[PDB]
Amino acid sequence: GLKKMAQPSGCVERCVVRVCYGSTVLNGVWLGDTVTCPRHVIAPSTTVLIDYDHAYSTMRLHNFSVSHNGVFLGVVGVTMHGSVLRIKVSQSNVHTPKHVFKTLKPGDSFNILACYEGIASGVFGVNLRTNFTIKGSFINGACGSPGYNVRNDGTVEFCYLHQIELGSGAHVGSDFTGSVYGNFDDQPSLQVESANLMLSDNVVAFLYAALLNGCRWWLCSTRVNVDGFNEWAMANGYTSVSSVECYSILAAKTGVSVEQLLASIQHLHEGFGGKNILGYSSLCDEFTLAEVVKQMYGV
Amino acid sequence: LKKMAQPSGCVERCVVRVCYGSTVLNGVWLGDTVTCPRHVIAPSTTVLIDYDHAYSTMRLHNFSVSHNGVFLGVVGVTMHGSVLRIKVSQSNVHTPKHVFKTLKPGDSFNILACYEGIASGVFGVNLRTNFTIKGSFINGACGSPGYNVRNDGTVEFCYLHQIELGSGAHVGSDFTGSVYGNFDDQPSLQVESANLMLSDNVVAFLYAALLNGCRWWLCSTRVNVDGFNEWAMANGYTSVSSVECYSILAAKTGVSVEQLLASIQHLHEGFGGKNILGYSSLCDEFTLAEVVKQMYGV
Numbered sequence: 158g159l160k161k162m163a164q165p166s167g168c169v170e171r172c173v174v175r176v177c178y179g180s181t182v183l184n185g186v187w188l189g190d191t192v193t194c195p196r197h198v199i200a201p202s203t204t205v206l207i208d209y210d211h212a213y214s215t216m217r218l219h220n221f222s223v224s225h226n227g228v229f230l231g232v233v234g235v236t237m238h239g240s241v242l243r244i245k246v247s248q249s250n251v252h253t254p255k256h257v258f259k260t261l262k263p264g265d266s267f268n269i270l271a272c273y274e275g276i277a278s279g280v281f282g283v284n285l286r287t288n289f290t291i292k293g294s295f296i297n298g299a300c301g302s303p304g305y306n307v308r309n310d311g312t313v314e315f316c317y318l319h320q321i322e323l324g325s326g327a328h329v330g331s332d333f334t335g336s337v338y339g340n341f342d343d344q345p346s347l348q349v350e351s352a353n354l355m356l357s358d359n360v361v362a363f364l365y366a367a368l369l370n371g372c373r374w375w376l377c378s379t380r381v382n383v384d385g386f387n388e389w390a391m392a393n394g395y396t397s398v399s400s401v402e403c404y405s406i407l408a409a410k411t412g413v414s415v416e417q418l419l420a421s422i423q424h425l426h427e428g429f430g431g432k433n434i435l436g437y438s439s440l441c442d443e444f445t446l447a448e449v450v451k452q453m454y455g456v
Numbered sequence: 457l458k459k460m461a462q463p464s465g466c467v468e469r470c471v472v473r474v475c476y477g478s479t480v481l482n483g484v485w486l487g488d489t490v491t492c493p494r495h496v497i498a499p500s501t502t503v504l505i506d507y508d509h510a511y512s513t514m515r516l517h518n519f520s521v522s523h524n525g526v527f528l529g530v531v532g533v534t535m536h537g538s539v540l541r542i543k544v545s546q547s548n549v550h551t552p553k554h555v556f557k558t559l560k561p562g563d564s565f566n567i568l569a570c571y572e573g574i575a576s577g578v579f580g581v582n583l584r585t586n587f588t589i590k591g592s593f594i595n596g597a598c599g600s601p602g603y604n605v606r607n608d609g610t611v612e613f614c615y616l617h618q619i620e621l622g623s624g625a626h627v628g629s630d631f632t633g634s635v636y637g638n639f640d641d642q643p644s645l646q647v648e649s650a651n652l653m654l655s656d657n658v659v660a661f662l663y664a665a666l667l668n669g670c671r672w673w674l675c676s677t678r679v680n681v682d683g684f685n686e687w688a689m690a691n692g693y694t695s696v697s698s699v700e701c702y703s704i705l706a707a708k709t710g711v712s713v714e715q716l717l718a719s720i721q722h723l724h725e726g727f728g729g730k731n732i733l734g735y736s737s738l739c740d741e742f743t744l745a746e747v748v749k750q751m752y753g754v
């Protein structure tokens with residue numbers, strides 16, 4: 158069946174550093190001569206709302222300690238951009254991979270390298286949900302852990318920097334420009350996220366994977382078009398489906414149109430009746446179209 | 457809880473592409489030795505493979521071995537069980553501090569899934585009681601390594617991918633050439649035994665549930681280890697190995713292992729429409745160590 162996996166982490170591990178300001182420690186990402194980290198590393202050890210403009214104005218460069226594998230880098234300057242700091246260091250990372258910065262959209266899959274004290278401990282795949290949170294596995298100190306994707310040509314897309322955990326347990330991050338996904342605050346406030354929607358594009362991909370693994374009991378004989386599904390979706394907690402043309406690869410290899418799968422989703426939403434689909438007892442929005450194509454065909 | 461893998465960078469630097477004639481798979485380069493599945497020298501044939509004949513007629517110049525497109529000189533080859541040890545003309549300067557370790561059912565480990573000597577994915581898996589794993593491998597994944605990283609940084613190399621069974625289950629060897637479950641590296645049928653639920657992992661899962669405030673399912677009944685183990689063998693579960701390793705979580709929750717053994721018996725047939733941490737049936741994916749590491753970092 159399908160397994161969530163991560164892309165290999167080697168090229169990203171060499172960019173992880175330990176960033177300390179005063180007593181506070183978290184992780185940063187060292188690319189060229191710049192270390193990016195969450196700005197809340199300079200927050201005071203009080204429990205009130207943080208005034209970041211005052212925190213930044215009173216910042217002292219000598220209070221920073223930035224290190225990679227216990228080797229200390231010299232801090233040259235620091236600027237604040239949204240919810241991140243860009244710490245200029247006197248040494249460029251000789252292991253900087255070919256890379257770009259990319260802002261995720263809901264439904265995008267990516268990889269997390271979970272880090273503590275500047276040392277990677279785990280790697281896993283995740284999906285950005287419609288409420289702009291992820292379900293990671295993080296403990297205290299994971300802030301600044303990077304999320305990434307690796308393109309076919311080897312370019313690393315840096316797309317997520319871990320920021321905070323919500324009361325629900327959901328995880329919030331920024332991109333490398335400092336924009337927080339979902340515009341949550343890097344504050345000790347109570348923040349309740351919107352409810353997540355089922356990612357209809359992923360459920361379609363999952364059903365195509367089921368057809369390709371011989372699992373076909375659930376297949377509706379009839380069809381519903383995109384307009385009818387999207388009307389149903391917004392009344393039943395699903396996203397609108399993108400476009401039928403995106404699935405041309407899987408539609409061609411199975412001979413099943415997206416509209417047949419949309420009809421099947423409407424049936425299966427009410428329940429499976431004790432049966433399962435690839436080990437799942439309800440519809441699965443964990444896997445993207447591209448993940449299904451890669452895991453089935455290597456493309 | 458999230459199944460995750462330990463970082464792969466130090467193992468990526470050991471993956472090589474191994475080719476014999478037209479056949480390509482992966483190998484693992486440590487020091488001046490590349491280990492790979494011996495079936496790379498199998499003839500293009502539909503018949504059972506005579507490996508002693510294939511080995512005695514092997515010629516070194518039919519091998520090509522490369523790391524990230526850089527080809528290595530091949531100096532000699534020996535056969536050990538279901539693996540070859542290819543001596544190459546230089547040592548891997550990025551060989552990590554490492555040992556070889558043979559897995560036992562119930563051990564978690566990491567797989568670096570590789571094709572043509574290039575890693576494409578990394579994930580955690582459990583060695584099941586039928587000595588197979590549920591990977592996501594497609595053709596060409598043979599030679600993909602399995603590993604664990606010790607706290608001191610030592611890499612344990614524990615799995616080399618060998619074959620896929622008709623069921624889709626995956627079979628590998630250790631680095632001494634012993635195939636887990638003693639499956640054969642042959643085109644024959646081969647059916648693995650029925651998989652058993654890993655009771656040690658299910659107990660850990662139920663403690664994680666308790667620690668997350670999910671306790672609708674908790675039994676006040678107690679079943680002792682001996683009684684549980686007798687029930688387990690008749691109900692598709694492994695024995696529970698021991699109780700004392702759970703004592704930290706038992707103290708935090710106030711719930712004994714024997715209560716969770718009773719709860720497994722209560723929940724074994726299903727949850728009746730409810731869920732535990734989002735699962736609709738008992739989960740044996742997570743070890744005690746994983747639950748303790750992911751919730752407390754220890």
Ligand SMILES: CC(C)(C)c1ccc(N(C(=O)c2c[nH]cn2)[C@@H](C(=O)NC2CCCCC2)c2cccnc2)cc1
Pocket residue numbers: 181182183197200295296297298299300320321322323324343344345346
């Ligand atoms: C300063 C500020 C913005 C209030 C803050 C304080 C602590 C952290 N958290 C650090 O772990 C951490 C480590 N170094 C610095 N912060 C944890 C975190 O989000 N707690 C609280 C944040 C707001 C109130 C509810 C929970 C954390 C992050 C990821 C996974 N699990 C725990 C994040 C932001």
Ligand SMILES: CC(C)(C)c1ccc(N(C(=O)c2c[nH]cn2)[C@@H](C(=O)NC2CCCCC2)c2cccnc2)cc1
Pocket residue numbers: 479480481495498593594595596597598618619620621622641642643644
């Ligand atoms: C020579 C021998 C022993 C018969 C053989 C042939 C092919 C392979 N398989 C290679 O993909 C592959 C790539 N390079 C060399 N073999 C695949 C594999 O197991 N097929 C068969 C093996 C026995 C008969 C039924 C299935 C494979 C697919 C997906 C994940 N894992 C392995 C393994 C062993």
